[PDB]
């Protein structure tokens, strides 16, 4: 699942918007990335 202290946000007119960090207080249009490879 996604990280502790988030939410997923959605839409204004055409159906766009994705993610917002709640403990920080930051809006975005992507996930926190979260996929390891060397680290």
């Amino acid at each position: 699942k996604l990280p502790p202290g988030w939410e997923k946000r959605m839409s204004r007119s055409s159906g766009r918007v994705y993610y917002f960090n709640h403990i920080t207080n930051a809006s975005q249009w992507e996930r926190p990335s979260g996929n390891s490879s060397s680290g």
Binding site: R9, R16, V17, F20, S27, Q28, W29
Partner: peptide, 13 residues
């Protein structure tokens, strides 16, 4: 503080 939700760049129009 009141706010709109902020996308990091913008929508491409």
């Amino acid at each position: 503080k009141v706010s709109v939700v902020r996308t990091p760049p913008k929508s491409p129009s």
